[PDB]
Amino acid sequence: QCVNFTNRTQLPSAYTNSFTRGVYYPDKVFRSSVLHSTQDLFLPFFSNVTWFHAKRFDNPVLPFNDGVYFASTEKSNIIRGWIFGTTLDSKTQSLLIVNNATNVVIKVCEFQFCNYPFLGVYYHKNNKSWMESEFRVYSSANNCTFEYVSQPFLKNLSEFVFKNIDGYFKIYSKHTPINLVRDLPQGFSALEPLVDLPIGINITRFQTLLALHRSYLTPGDSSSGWTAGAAAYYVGYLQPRTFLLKYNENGTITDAVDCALDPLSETKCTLKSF
Amino acid sequence: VQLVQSGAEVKKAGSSVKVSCKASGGTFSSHTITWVRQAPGQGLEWMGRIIPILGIANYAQKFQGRVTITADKSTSTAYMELSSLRSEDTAVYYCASLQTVDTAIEKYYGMDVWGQGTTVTVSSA
Amino acid sequence: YELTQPPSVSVSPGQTASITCSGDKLGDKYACWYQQKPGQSPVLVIYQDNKRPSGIPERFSGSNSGNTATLTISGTQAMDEADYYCQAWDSSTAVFGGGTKLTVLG
Ligand SMILES: *[C@@H]1O[C@H](CO)[C@@H](O)[C@H](O)[C@H]1NC(C)=O
Ligand SMILES: *[C@@H]1O[C@H](CO)[C@@H](O)[C@H](O)[C@H]1NC(C)=O
Ligand SMILES: *[C@@H]1O[C@H](CO)[C@@H](O)[C@H](O)[C@H]1NC(C)=O
Ligand SMILES: *[C@@H]1O[C@H](CO)[C@@H](O)[C@H](O)[C@H]1NC(C)=O
Ligand SMILES: *[C@@H]1O[C@H](CO)[C@@H](O)[C@H](O)[C@H]1NC(C)=O
Ligand SMILES: *[C@@H]1O[C@H](CO)[C@@H](O)[C@H](O)[C@H]1NC(C)=O
């Protein structure tokens, strides 16, 4: 269960440019060759997105605010899921999203979460498809009210948008091939709606679930021999913005205008043109 | 993690023996307490296991219906009760611990911490 | 499930000691190796067929191929005279070998 790590190094965090990332489909309505103006929780264009890149690195609990844009460019699959909640203990409800090779598990329960929640990842006889997961996320899970099992959604940039509005937890996602190591790619890629969860819970904080390998063992000490948890991900925060989204012939959002970015975007959203 | 057991002792044949294993303070949060016995002149032999943080006890087929492995989170003590003692039960009873609570992960670990062993012998008189 | 193990292996001090452990398809299973001095608790010296716990000296090594798991000691010195137990996990039950009494000649 809970492994208490000590002398945790803080994750270094730089500030990258958002460019035009994080646009999602705001509804499930097919629109063809139009410009649709919508007011919603969007990541603003060219915003400061904080980049957490990387012994023992701290896995920080970050604020949720009005919704989280979460991107990752990883090949080791160190990020396995996220926890969401307010106290992140048994006094309040909490949301847990865990992926594996076959399924995603989404549970709203009363979790007494560990201070450093993770998954122990083990390969049986060095077989890369025989991967077993040990839950070191919570010490207890009581009065559990929601559970949902589906297909997993975890070179390739993976982007997610998490919103908690009207009693619904909405997740949007996109996976695109990129050729950058430093920062987020330019261009446009709209995030398709992944899941709407009727859970009706209060979310103010969130934390990334890591995957650690037991590299070596020390008898008597359960905090030794795990990997450092060197994970790199981008976190941005959604704000209430008006966006002018261009839907092409086949119904795909190809470009957007953030109406409050500069006077030219204000003019574009007033004229309803690009 | 340190496992401390009860004292070496003698019991009646057909009596009830109650062997304790006092762990450290934070041990039962994330450990599995196995019980392994060693007869004098023979090798080790697995008797059972307990996961106290989620409260299950699994037993060997030879000891099933005879032993009952319990735990106490407040005193942090894993107990092993063995009833109907015969002459073949005189053994050193070790409590061992694994750094896992999921029993499918137990193949990736060994019993790294062991108790000092309780020598349980039986006698009619 | 049963694990077969030789009863005794005797080596010279400073030579390489090999202790085998046969089993039915043991190469598909993880085998731990435990060391027990006379009058002491067992000490885990090999887990996951080849990995040492920290604090175990580097001369202990392990392998597991086919039907046999082998514990090898390179440069056997005076503190290796013990009993060595091969342990496997079958159907989420630990099973132990008979144990080899490794002695050091004098
Ligand atoms: C936000 O971005 C600007 C550059 O656009 C940078 O100067 C500033 O330091 C960033 N904010 C923080 C808190 O680093
Ligand atoms: C949501 O959580 C915050 C932080 O614990 C708390 O201050 C607030 O009152 C909560 N809101 C509701 C409606 O419970
Ligand atoms: C993934 O998690 C689900 C939980 O619903 C489980 O049924 C499945 O066996 C897991 N897959 C692996 C490979 O562990
Ligand atoms: C890896 O595990 C899968 C079962 O998940 C099995 O089908 C496959 O044969 C294994 N690979 C090897 C090389 O044994
Ligand atoms: C939550 O669980 C605890 C123990 O599991 C129980 O005592 C309590 O009554 C439960 N609360 C609700 C609202 O079900
Ligand atoms: C839309 O679909 C048509 C036919 O499926 C295809 O030829 C075209 O490339 C697609 N994309 C755009 C932007 O029109």
Residue numbers in the entry:
A (entry chain A): 14 to 67, 77 to 176, 187 to 306
B (entry chain H): 21 to 145
C (entry chain L): 22 to 127
The article reads:
Given its crucial role in the viral replicative cycle, the spike protein represents an important therapeutic target and is a critical antigen in host immune responses. All emerging variants contain defining mutations within their spike proteins, with multiple mutations clustering within the receptor-binding domain (RBD) impacting both ACE2 binding and antibody neutralization escape, while mutations within the highly antigenic loops in the N-terminal domain (NTD) across these variants reduce antibody neutralization.
Here, we report structural analysis of the NTD region in the Gamma variant, stabilized using Fab fragments of the NTD-directed antibodies 4A823 and 4–824. We obtained Cryo-EM reconstructions for Gamma spike protein–Fab complexes with all 3 NTDs bound for both 4A8 and 4–8. The bound antibody fragments improve the resolution of this flexible domain upon focused refinement, enabling the determination of structures at resolutions of ~2.6 Å both for the overall spike and the NTD-antibody interface. Identical positioning of the N1 loop is observed in the Gamma NTD-4-8 structure, further confirming these mutational effects. The mutations L18F, D138Y, and T20N cluster close together, forming multiple interactions which stabilize the alternate N1 conformation. Thus, the unique interactions conferred by mutations within the Gamma NTD stabilize local conformations which are sterically incompatible with wild-type N1 positioning, causing N1 loop rearrangement. Our analysis shows that the highly mutated Gamma N-terminal domain exhibits considerable structural rearrangements, partially explaining its decreased neutralization by convalescent sera.
